[PDB]
Every structure is written in structure tokens, then in C-alpha cells.
Amino acid sequence: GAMNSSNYAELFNNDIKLFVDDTNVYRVTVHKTFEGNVATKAINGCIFTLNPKTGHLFLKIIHTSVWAGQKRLSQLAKWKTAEEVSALVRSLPKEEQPKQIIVTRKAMLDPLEVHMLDFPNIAIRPTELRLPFSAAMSIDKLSDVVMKATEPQMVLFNIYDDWLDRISSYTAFSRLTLLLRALKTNEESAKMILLSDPTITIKSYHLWPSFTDEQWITIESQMRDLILTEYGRKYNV
Amino acid sequence: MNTVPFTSAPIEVTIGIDQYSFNVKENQPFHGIKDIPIGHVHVIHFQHADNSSMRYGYWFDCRMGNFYIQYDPKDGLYKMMEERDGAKFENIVHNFKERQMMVSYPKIDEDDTWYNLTEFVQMDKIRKIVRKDENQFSYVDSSMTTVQENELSDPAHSLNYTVINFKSREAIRPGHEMEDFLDKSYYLNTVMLQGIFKNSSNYFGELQFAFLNAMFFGNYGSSLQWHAMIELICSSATVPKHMLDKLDEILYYQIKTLPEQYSDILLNERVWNICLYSSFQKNSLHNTEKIMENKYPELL
């Protein structure tokens, strides 16, 4: 069934499962034409597919070329997302294929399900959680590799850097989502917080600064405080 | 004109014949239905005064033999049977008619209703959906499950309706995933019409039987099959123009014949709002749309 707070710790058992977020697959800018009508210009997009347990991310870059000459693009984006996820599953060895794929938006169920007809034993699941994975393009190195791409490309990351060397999956995923939640609600503040101190650098092979344990504690508190602050501003509380 | 005699009426029961019905009192002297039009299929059906659950009935065709009804006290239901002995059968019919203990198939001559509801229904096709080849007539009741329902238990008592599934390899050509799921034309025209049903008339025949079973027995899987079949057409962008006009007529008369008080369980809100307003065929069910709006505006 649907993922929610009840069945939350299932994410971290030893059943391979992937999250698929499609919010960044079709990205446009909106602008005025010489005649004054509105027109859209697409930019490079991406499928965010993440194993919450292991941190393995399969960032499938979507090149603007894929839209060329197509109608009902926002509809098409869901079908292309499912097309790529399916091909990713087909590319994986059997023992690495997932037992479940959880889509962050309900509109992806039908296309995925149709594209996965060949894998009847992979469960496609919706979720009631409000995951912040749209903010993935606020991570500088991810937004950079997408924006530069000149062709469809798959790029592999571990979204957790080396955290698992020291903390559990559960904790890593909590940190991950806390950090993207913050980046989603106020990107400028969130980014300020992460990079204020120039002496804490990002390894070339990493996405996030090399905070020590005590420093992650301060960061997470700063991220928490940020998120509450913005809520009060949002609703006048 | 044909006759279906009854041995007796031992228990109080509401007897239906096609869309007509009558109350018969316990051990009232009732002995059958006369003046039954030859040339179509018919359904005689039953609801005991004591158990309003379980409606049950038999589909038949008088051209295929001489059939009669006899209450079985062991099984506690009215059973259809065949007399092979013509003389002995004409003998029982003539006597009961002389004694005038039979009701007449009360057909108004202006009325094409039963014909429109059964136009494409053919007894041979029914006997493939209700397999019991020792009888020329077919039994159906409220509780019988379909084959597709049995997949998601006893197969002898199954409704072997043709299995339609929009999320199946059958319905979806590899590489035309998105195309085929939004525009089911492939599944309807090649897979189902040309492949399985062979022609529109068998398709339409199963569609109308599915409807009549949901209507006369509240057979929930029949309801599901009828809707599945409507949906497949209306979700197809490319349909023969003759099927569309015949479909509009078919649905019109089904919506017309439905009991007004049952529209809540028998009509699937999503399917109808799709056929009439969202689908490719939104513009192509003028009669069906007009009757749905003026009779069940709420469900829309």
C-alpha cells in the first residue's frame, strides 16, 4: 500500500527499494514573446531515483532535446520518467533490481505500472509523505551536472557522502530530508548555513561539506530553526 | 409463439420473464408462461418471497427445445428442465392452456424494448460463458463470480466473460506503452474485435448479456464486465462509425430499462463521466448522453 509515517521504518530494512521523484523532469522558464504572448523555454531536467537505504542515486539527466516536437509535454514527462526508470531496472542485475518502487507523486503510478508490466513482482507504490526531493536541484553539484549536459546522461552519486561510515540509514535519510526540506523552504538561508565557514570544504567526490559529528549537530539545529522560522512567516503564527 | 409450463408453484415467489414479472402465492395454481416470442433469447428468473437475496434465473431459446419449470424441494429452487418427448410436452401445454392457468407474455406491439436489449445476444455465445453443456439453457444467480474475479474459486460455477485488463501485456504493445494506454484503439480493434470476438456483434452480444445479468440478478461481476466493455470503446480514438451509432442505441435502452432506484450500485460514476464527457467518444453518444442527463443528473 501507500507509504506514510506508520510504515516509515520499512525504508531501511534489507528489501531493495527506490524512490522516484519526477518533479524536475520537465523544467521551463516562462517569458513574453515579441508579440506579447507567453511562451515557455525548457531547460535540462532530471529523474531523481534514490535507494534510501544505501544512498545510491541514479540521476537520469533529461536533455531538452527529448521534448523537441512533442505536445502535452507535462503528460509526456510522466511516460518518459517511467520509460527511463524501467530501463534502469532492466539494466541492473537481477539481485540488484528493487522489490518496490515508491513514486513521490501519485500521477506516476499508471505510467510506471504500465512500463513495469514485465516485472509483475516489483510493487509500485504511492506515498502520503511530503518528501522534499524537488529541492534536489538546490544541491549545487547536481544542478551543475544537469545544466551542463549536452545529451541524455546517467550520473551516479551517493547522496549521503560517507555518512553511513558513522551513522545509520534511518539517520542519514533524516539528515538528507531535513537538509532538502530547509533548502526547499528558503534556499538562500539554507545555503548560507551550509557554507558560511570557509574552512569546511566539500570533497571532490561529495555533495555536502565534511562536517565533523559535532558540526552536523549544529547544522541540523540551524536547519531546524530555519524551517520553523519560515513556517511562522508563512501563516502568521 | 412458445410456452414454458410449470409443474407447480410450491412456494411464494416473484417470477420474472424478460423485463416482466408477477407475484405467485404459495401453492397458487400457476402453470407457466405462454405467448413467448420465438426469435430472441429469454430469461426466466426467480426471487423467493422468503429470501430476497439470491435472485436466479435461466437463459434460453425456445427454438432449441421444449423447456419447463419444476420446483425441487431438496435444492429448494425452481429448476429449468427439458422434455425430449414432443407429444408428451404438447400434451401438458395444451391442457394447462385449456384450463387457462398460464399468464401471457404481455408484449405491447409498439414495444421494441426486449429486442433492443438482446439484439446481439446469441444463446450459443451464452453457453460458452456459462459452461454446463448437458443443458440447452443456462443458469445464473446473484452470487456467481467471474473468471477475472476468480483470479484476483470453484470454476464450474464461473462466468467465463472475456477478460479485459487495461494494464496488461495484451493491451499494451512494448514501445507503444503511453500511446496504447491513452488510446486503446489497438486493444479494441486488433486484439479484441479481430482477435477474440471476431466481429462487433459478438462483442456487443457479450456486452448486453453482461448488462442483463447485472440488472436481473445484481451480479456484481456482470456489472464490472459491462463497464469494462463500454470503457474500452470510449477510450479508443478510432472506432468503426457503425459500432458508435449501435453503441449509443444499446446503452440508451439499457439506461432506459434500468430500475430508477438501483442507479447507485449499477452505474460506475467514473466510467460514465469518462465515456460522455472526457473520452474520445464524448460527442458520439447523443442519445445515451441525453437520457443520462434527464434521468440521473446526480451521478454526473
UniProtKB/Swiss-Prot annotation, chain A:
Mutagenesis / variant outcome for changing D21N: Reduced growth at 30 degrees Celsius. Strongly reduced growth at 16 degrees Celsius
Recorded consequence of changing D22A: Reduced growth at 30 degrees Celsius. Strongly reduced growth at 16 degrees Celsius. Strongly reduced growth at 35 degrees Celsius
Region described as RNase H homology domain: spans on this chain: 7-237
Cellular localization per UniProt: Nucleus
UniProt remark on domains: The MPN (JAB/Mov34) domain has structural similarity with deubiquitinating enzymes, but lacks the residues that would bind the catalytic metal ion. Contains a region with structural similarity to reverse transcriptase, presenting the classical thumb, fingers and palm architecture, but lacks enzyme activity, since the essential metal-binding residues are not conserved.
Any further remark recorded for this protein: Present with 468 molecules/cell in log phase SD medium.
Function summary: Functions as a scaffold that mediates the ordered assembly of spliceosomal proteins and snRNAs. Required for association of BRR2 with the spliceosomal U5 snRNP, and the subsequent assembly of the U4/U6-U5 tri-snRNP complex. Functions as a scaffold that positions spliceosomal U2, U5 and U6 snRNAs at splice sites on pre-mRNA substrates, so that splicing can occur. Interacts with both the 5' and the 3' splice site, as well as the branch region. Has a role in branch site-3' splice site selection. Associates with the branch site-3' splice 3'-exon region. Also has a role in cell cycle.
Subunit structure: Component of the U4/U6-U5 tri-snRNP complex composed of the U4, U6 and U5 snRNAs and at least PRP3, PRP4, PRP6, PRP8, PRP18, PRP31, PRP38, SNU13, SNU23, SNU66, SNU114, SPP381, SMB1, SMD1, SMD2, SMD3, SMX2, SMX3, LSM2, LSM3, LSM4, LSM5, LSM6, LSM7, LSM8, BRR2 and DIB1.
Name recorded for this polypeptide: Pre-mRNA-splicing factor 8
Portion of the full sequence shown: 1836 to 2069 of 2413
Curated annotation (Swiss-Prot), chain B:
Region (Leucine-zipper): 244-265
GO BP terms, alphabetized: spliceosomal snRNP assembly; spliceosomal tri-snRNP complex assembly
Effect of S236A: No effect on interaction with PRP8
Keywords: Cytoplasm, mRNA processing, mRNA splicing, Nucleus, Phosphoprotein
Gene3D superfamilies per the UniProt record, alphabetical: 2.60.34.20, Aar2, C-terminal domain-like (1.25.40.550)
Major place of residence: cytoplasm
GO cellular component: cytoplasm; U5 snRNP
Keyword Phosphoprotein: yes
InterPro entries per UniProt: AAR2, AAR2_C, AAR2_C_sf, Aar2_N, AAR2_N_sf
Chain positions found as Phosphothreonine: T257
Subunit structure: Heterodimer. Interacts with PRP8 (via RNase H homology domain and MPN domain), competing with BRR2 for the same binding site. Component of a U5 snRNP complex that contains at least the U5 snRNA, PRP8, SNU114, AAR2, SMB1, SMD1, SMD2, SMD3, SME1, SMX2 and SMX3, but is not a component of the U4/U6-U5 tri-snRNP complex.
UniProt name for this protein: A1 cistron-splicing factor AAR2
Organism expressing this protein natively: Saccharomyces cerevisiae (strain ATCC 204508 / S288c)
